[PDB]
From a paper:
The HBV core protein (also known as HBcAg or Cp) is an essential component and regulator of the HBV life cycle. The full length core protein Cp183 or its N-terminal domain Cp149 predominantly assembles into a T = 4 icosahedral capsid. Due to its critical roles in capsid assembly, pregenomic RNA packaging, cccDNA maintenance and suppression of innate immunity, the HBV core protein has been recognized as an attractive antiviral target. To identify the specific interaction modes between core protein and HAP_R01 or SBA_R01, we crystallized the Cp149 mutant Y132A, which remains as dimer in high salt solution and destabilizes Cp149 capsid.
In parallel, we identified SBA_R01, a novel capsid assembly modulator belonging to sulfamoylbenzamide (SBA) series through a focused library screening. The crystal structures of core protein with HAP_R01 or SBA_R01 were determined at 1.95 Å or 1.69 Å resolutions, respectively. HAP_R01 and SBA_R01 bind to the same dimer-dimer interface in the Y132A structures. For SBA_R01, the contact surface is 402.3 Å2 with 60% of the area from the B chain as well. The binding concave and cap of SBA_R01 pocket are composed of similar set of residues, except that L37, T109, F122 from chain B and R133 from chain C do not directly contact SBA_R01. The halogenated phenyl group at the 4th position of HAP_R01 superimposes with that of the aniline of SBA_R01. In contrast, the piperidyl group of SBA_R01 is fully accessible to solvent. Noteworthily, the benzamide core of SBA_R01 does not superimpose with the dihydropyrimidine core of HAP_R01, suggesting the dimer-dimer interface of HBV core protein can be targeted by different chemical scaffolds. Although SBA_R01 binds to the same interface, the conformational changes may be so small that the energetic difference is not sensed by other dimers.
Author numbering:
A (entry chain C): 1 to 142
B (entry chain D), F (entry chain B): 1 to 155
C (entry chain E): 1 to 143, 149 to 155
D (entry chain F): 1 to 142, 150 to 155
E (entry chain A): 1 to 141, 149 to 155
């Protein structure tokens, strides 16, 4: 099956890709923000919203991936190739989860339309060369 | 955070653990069934239901895990070590996803109540030694909400 | 082009794929059944139905594959590899034709909706581990005025 | 069973054989014409016509025959015996599929009666010796309901 | 993105591909025809039509492609390498622009629906073997009360 | 023939030249923005506007140049030269295409009159020596949909 996790939320993988990689916080900083803002809702027996349902699964999936990556790095054929599994996480699946976690956390905080407008505003601003770019980035606010 | 993926759906990790591991189809057989029964809804731009939203993420998460496991296994010279990665998937994260996929797929067809009643019925039947247990396992189906006498009375 | 031969019949290659390979009868047995049930219609100068048209072509296509396999094994090969090519055709493309012949024969015999519901029922049953699986498979089957008694 | 693929379409294998082998377009050109003129209909979930059903199957069957002949050519370790398989295909089943693809594509494009009348006209004209044969071939010239 | 340059003009890349490569004029002859028939319009500050807008860009793009292909051809030392590049251009982007320039020039000159009907007619005619093909290609182009 | 691709749009090559070369985004960033903002219109069977028709052709033309330059590079004997022809294209026509893609994308987003006024404003600002140049560049922004006069009229 070819599922786009953003599609039921009015976005697409291609649109999230318009943000540069270094826009996103780390997964750890995203997970700490999800707890600070939504821990009680995420841990409750209520659905709350489709964003909460999706965010719950993503949090648990990152736990699955890191447990697997930890086992690989620890019970290893080599020494110091641990650096290799880390690099794959940083390059590949870490970026996917930074996009996804940022998307759900921001939509819960600012609303989908505000988030998507900001995404396009920032993506255009950051691609404007510094010769022309206004000094302050667009603002994400309700 | 300590999130139980079943809690918003009226169940718990411990309850799903009551089914034995060899009750569940493989992840592959579950994913092929999810596609045969629900592909169009899963791929659509509509939420459809909280079970659909959760099932979408679980399908994608399995892809993430297998891609990671494949990259590791492919970049391993020792073929016995590739067999270690497969065995780790089979022993640990495969069973979690067999439980989770089975739960959402079955709930989407039969409803939470029927599924949880069946889970408990099967878990009790399979723990009964075979001399005492009827030869046929409990059946998974939604029981009629009313008797035939009740149905006819309200015609 | 990207033609799916099931699409005009309300199905897809991927849906037929949901049945395991060992569900389908052999090609020989499918061709025997097509003859026993439908020979006169298949040989008639009438279209009869889209299923009949498709089934005619499928039967002839299998004939083309077998004729080619045999001519290659007969005219050329040693006696030992006489059946080598027939063996490849049955291995690779046999499953595709077992699916296709089964679909049209069963649709003609039981109706499309009955067949498609049975297909999904069987695919779920067979993926249920035998610990939990009821012993009997799902069944493929199809189903006076008051004045008379006054 | 004895199935003639043309019988439900009002023709026969023997009638298509009345056209000389070099009358028919190549398989490549027939497949490109089916795509250029009918790709959307052939790929649609609608039956459209008995010709569409036959064309769908014939197109897919040709693909299978090509995979089979290729496997034969690759696994026949004698380079001369790969050459017999090719020439046999061109002489026998290649001609069968050129006939079949031509028939259905032409019926959809020019109309069934027009195709069948033209077929007989062309077959008579080409058998007329050049001492007597007019220089130009007969003329082939131009919703749909299908009874039994 | 997957942009088909013909889609906004009611055609597709696959349909233009139905014409054989030797149907099209050379690029030089297409560019001379665009100039002879449309130079003033193409050079004007008016849009004129979407065909003119597309044709302007295609003419300029071909110039860029030719400046590149020329630079490559001149700086190669081996005649077989230079012929590899010409052959690659002729088969690929050279053919694409012959198709594209022909399409817009002919739509402007003969009308769009005339062009599309003719394309399909020609593609079928040229695939008909010469044994059956008519010698000439397809053509591209009151009551009494009235007088009382 | 002497065709200026900007002439039917009320501009000229020389006017686009008034912007310095390091003003323009990279080709990759322009193509990413065209997709993010206009993919559906660009891929649709409608003309939409002369800017869309021109932008479609420019996108495809850059692709043609890159495909040819990439293929030629694959034939070069020295693997270190694999991108030599791609570099030649960027060096000789990269700026031309950055100008053209920027022009159509910005006109679709802000309107031709706004774009041309901004172009002149920026070109004058950047030529003002830094001793006198105010720190913030002119701003490129869409006109408001309704004027203050109209807003007050409907109060
Ligand atoms: O996306 C952002 N941050 C982020 C998101 C997450 F989902 C995280 F998990 C996480 F760690 C950080 C972001 C982007 C722009 C921005 F300007 C600010 S802001 O300065 O903080 N701010 C401005 C004023 C508003 O009123 C509120 C927010 C924050
Ligand atoms: O698909 C089946 N068989 C098949 C199909 C073909 F197209 C063939 F060519 C061919 F040889 C065999 C099949 C599947 C399930 C099944 F239960 C039976 S059943 O027992 O025979 N049966 C039950 C009662 C009904 O009333 C009638 C049929 C048959
Ligand atoms: O859980 C089961 N199967 C399963 C679930 C999934 F989520 C899968 F992905 C997958 F492959 C298989 C199961 C358990 C008991 C059982 F009896 C049957 S049954 O025989 O098939 N059956 C009975 C009648 C009903 O009406 C229908 C289904 C199936
Ligand atoms: O496409 C054709 N030519 C072409 C197109 C271009 F875009 C060119 F740039 C260019 F050089 C040549 C073509 C095709 C068939 C054909 F029969 C003729 S025709 O003889 O010339 N003719 C017949 C009567 C009509 O009324 C007028 C045209 C011309
Ligand atoms: O059978 C023919 N062509 C064919 C068929 C197919 F099924 C193909 F796939 C394919 F490539 C070519 C054929 C035979 C005679 C003939 F004169 C022409 S004609 O010149 O083209 N012509 C004349 C005027 C009409 O009005 C239209 C058609 C075409
Ligand atoms: O031309 C610019 N950027 C650009 C154009 C393209 F065509 C691209 F493809 C691409 F990547 C970047 C540009 C120029 C000045 C400027 F100030 C900004 S701004 O800061 O982003 N901004 C300000 C507020 C408005 O409201 C909106 C936009 C952007
Ligand atoms: Cl909280
Ligand atoms: Cl579905
Ligand atoms: Cl049982
Ligand atoms: Cl019979
Ligand atoms: Cl079509």
């Amino acid at each position: 099956m070819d599922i786009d996790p953003y599609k039921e939320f009015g976005a697409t993988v291609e649109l999230l890709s318009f943000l540069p990689s270094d826009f996103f916080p780390s997964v750890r900083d995203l997970l700490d923000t999800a707890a600070a803002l939504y821990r009680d809702a995420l841990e409750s027996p209520e659905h709350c919203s489709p964003h909460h349902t999706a965010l719950r699964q993503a949090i648990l999936c990152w736990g699955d991936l890191m447990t697997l990556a930890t086992w690989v790095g620890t019970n290893l054929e080599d020494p110091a190739s641990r650096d290799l599994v880390v690099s794959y996480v940083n390059t590949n699946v870490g970026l996917k989860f930074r996009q996804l976690l940022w998307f759900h956390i921001s939509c819960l905080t600012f609303g989908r339309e505000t988030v998507l407008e900001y995404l396009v505003s920032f993506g255009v601003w950051i691609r404007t060369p510094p010769a022309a770019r206004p000094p302050n980035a667009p603002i994400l606010s309700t």
